[PDB]
Amino acid sequence: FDLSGLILCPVLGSIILIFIPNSRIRLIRLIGLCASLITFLYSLVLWIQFDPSTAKFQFVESLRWLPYENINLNLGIDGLSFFFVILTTFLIPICILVGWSGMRSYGKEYIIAFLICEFLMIAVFCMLDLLLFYVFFESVLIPMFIIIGVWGSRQRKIKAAYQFFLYTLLGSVFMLLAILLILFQTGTADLQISLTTEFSERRQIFLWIAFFAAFAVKVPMVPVHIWLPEAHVEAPTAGSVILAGILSKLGTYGFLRFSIPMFPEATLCFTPFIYTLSAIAIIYTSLTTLRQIDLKKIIAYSSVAHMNLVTIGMFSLNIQGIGGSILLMLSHGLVLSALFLCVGVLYDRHKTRLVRYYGGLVSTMPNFSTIFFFFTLANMSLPGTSSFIGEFLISVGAFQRNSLVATLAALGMILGAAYSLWLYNRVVSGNLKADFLHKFSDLNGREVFIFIPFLVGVVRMGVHPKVFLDRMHTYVSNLVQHGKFN
Amino acid sequence: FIMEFAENLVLKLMEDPKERDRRFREHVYRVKDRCEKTKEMWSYPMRPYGFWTFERHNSQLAWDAQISQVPGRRDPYDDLLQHYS
């Protein structure tokens, strides 16, 4: 039961699908789903054997990549990456389950791309080498770009893919410069040595600036968020699920893992900068979410706002703030996936995204209305939900650190309770528009089952977040204690 | 007894903390030694110190010492004296 086995599980299924004719769509679907579910169960078995007491990386595995230059492949988890590994491994089979009905048109390339993306995600999150972490960090760029371009709804998919690729490439390239500078300075790219080595204050500032640019391309900040709504709008529903609950979480993971502990003085110097960026992004993005006409754009801007709340919660360098950041990362991955699944269901039924056509879906889709109401509540961060747990812990940390930025972040509550309610009322409440839409169908068995794990996860992480919280207190404490020796 | 068996199985899973700490210490020490070794490897200049004294680089001297008696490059007085004796 090892991380190498976890990484290799998608590879075997991917190869099997590559070497199967496209005419056996039933076999392709079944084998892809079986591989995804087997990997999910394997990750759960990895969960039931995780030690939350030690601060060292648990399942460290070493492979000889380059015997010289100290770029050997190190695979390991410590508690923060672990829930992200579980989240990706759980979210991948949902993507196959979504395209189950019309998978012949998608072809086996769809499942192969998603399995390769899963392989890349597990490789990113299970990594103790800076250079290899960057390698897989930028590897994830291929499958998502191909997915968005090939399986996009309309011709704007080309522009969306171009923007996504160019932004992420620029960020990754600057990160590569910084990483190679660190390699030349220290003699190795190993995470432990990089954490235990000093850097000059000017060198710390420059390296942190490069890392911040790279990760702020991923986690949407004020100037570089405009590529995300278009990417979600033009990507398919499964691609949107992945890009919302997986890649942004990758970015914030990379930021939290390689920026805060590696450069303490630089983080302290730049802490007000990210506070003001996050407050401005939260307020502006919530307000521009209020005045939107596209469902995918609305949930994408909600993603931007909540990711900026996450990044406002990390530099609150305390247990409450960092734990809330991680918990809201997981919760927002689940909630974004669920909301994009609801919008994808609506699009698959009625091939439109404008909310002007939609209205009064209670009378025709009551199960969908209930699911949409619950997930809009989760996005709103109602108490008793994982998003509320994360948001309140983040706000507690922000108030313990800086009251002004805490209040600015808490202003997001009113705005997030506005657009969510107003969108839900538009789409679900009201009277039917028989001239626009006159044939309806409620959620079928497959979609209902797909929504089941999301509800259970949200409720379990909201009512009783003790398991998730206790699985990471040791790492959070060690991360905050890294810089000081008192 | 089901819970007891489950606890025993979980304990059979996981990793020994002592072995984990020992492996961590060994790996960190190995990485530190190898990284200082690679730094000292990179510190060497491209042009070596003794390159002007190397036999491969001083290859013209041996050939010209061998070939110094060829009439195309003979000192005239040497030819004169070898004619005289």
CB A285 within 8 A of CB A297: no
For residue A121, which of A145, A144, A98 has the smallest C-alpha distance? A144
Six token digits for residue A156: 């704007």
CA distance A335 to A293: 20
User: Measured between alpha carbons, how far is residue A24 from residues A35, A37, A162, A174 in Å?
Assistant: 17, 20, 33, 44
CA distance A279 to A305: 9
Instruction: Please report where in the chains the tokens 């699911």 appear, as a residue.
Output: A371
Q: Is A49 on the interface with B (CB under 8 A)?
A: yes
Q: Give the resolution in Å.
A: 3.2
Chain B residue numbers touching A79 (CB-CB < 8 A): none
The partner residue sitting opposite A54, judged by closest CB among B17, B35, B42, is B17
- The sign of the torsion formed by the CA atoms of A191, A193, A196, A200 equals negative
Which residues touch B48 (CB under 8 Å, ≥6 apart)?
B54
CA distance A418 to B49: 74
Distance from the Cα of residue B79 to its chain's centroid: 50
CA distance A269 to chain B (A): 29
Which residues touch A108 (CB under 8 Å, ≥6 apart)?
A17, A18, A20, A22, A25, A28, A32
For residue A380, which of A270, A298, A269 has the smallest C-alpha distance? A298
**A 313-352 residues inside an 8 A Cβ radius of B:** none
Percent of chain A as helix, strand, coil, to the nearest 5: 70, 0, 25
How many Cβ atoms are within 10 Å of A481's Cβ, its own excluded? 13
For residue A309, which of A378, A395, A401 has the smallest C-alpha distance? A395
Phi-psi bin for A242: left (phi > 0), alpha (psi -120 to 50), beta? alpha
Q: Is A188 on the interface with B (CB under 8 A)?
A: yes
CA distance B34 to chain A (A): 7
Chain B residue numbers touching A128 (CB-CB < 8 A): none
CA distance A471 to A128: 19
Which helix (DSSP H) or strand (DSSP E) does residue A325 occupy?
Answer: helix A319-349
User: Measured between alpha carbons, how far is residue A390 from residues A149, A276, A310, A393, A411 in Å?
Assistant: 34, 20, 9, 5, 16
For B85, counting Cβ atoms within 10 Å of its Cβ (0-12 exposed, 13-18 middle, 19+ buried), the class is exposed
- Are the beta carbons of A62 and B10 separated by less than 8 Å? no
Best A70, A78, A180 member to test B by mutation, with max B CBs in 10 Å, is A70
Instruction: Please report where in the chains the tokens 């990711």 appear, as a residue.
Output: A307
Six token digits for residue A308: 């900026």
Q: Is A50 on the interface with B (CB under 8 A)?
A: yes
Instruction: Please report where in the chains the tokens 């993507």 appear, as a residue.
Output: A95
- Are the beta carbons of B15 and A59 separated by less than 8 Å? yes
- Are the beta carbons of A68 and B32 separated by less than 8 Å? no
Q: What is the DSSP letter of A354?
A: B
Phi-psi bin for A349: left (phi > 0), alpha (psi -120 to 50), beta? alpha
CB A132 within 8 A of CB A71: yes
Q: Is B30 on the interface with A (CB under 8 A)?
A: no
User: Measured between alpha carbons, how far is residue A280 from residues A225, A283, A408 in Å?
Assistant: 12, 5, 8
Q: What is the DSSP letter of A435?
A: T
For residue A354, which of A243, A438, A437, A440 has the smallest C-alpha distance? A437
- DSSP characters for A158-213? HHHHHHHHHHHHHHHHHHHHHHHHHHHHHS--BHHHHHHS---HHHHHHHHHHHHH
Beta bridge partners of A75: A61
Instruction: Please report where in the chains the tokens 């996981």 appear, as a residue.
Output: B14
Six token digits for residue A24: 């056996």
- DSSP characters for A94-117? HHHHHTTTTHHHH-HHHHHHHHHH
φ/ψ of residue A190, rounded to 5: -65, 140
Q: Is A193 on the interface with B (CB under 8 A)?
A: yes
- Are the beta carbons of A188 and B35 separated by less than 8 Å? yes
- Are the beta carbons of B34 and A50 separated by less than 8 Å? no
**A 63-82 residues inside an 8 A Cβ radius of B:** 68-70
For residue A304, which of A369, A231, A265, A248 has the smallest C-alpha distance? A248
- Are the beta carbons of B15 and A51 separated by less than 8 Å? yes
Method for this entry: cryo-EM
Q: Is B7 on the interface with A (CB under 8 A)?
A: no
Coil, strand, or helix at residue A73?
A: strand
- Are the beta carbons of A188 and B23 separated by less than 8 Å? no
Phi-psi bin for A356: left (phi > 0), alpha (psi -120 to 50), beta? alpha
CA distance A335 to A344: 14
Q: What is the DSSP letter of A156?
A: T
CA distance B35 to A357: 63
Coil, strand, or helix at residue A294?
A: strand
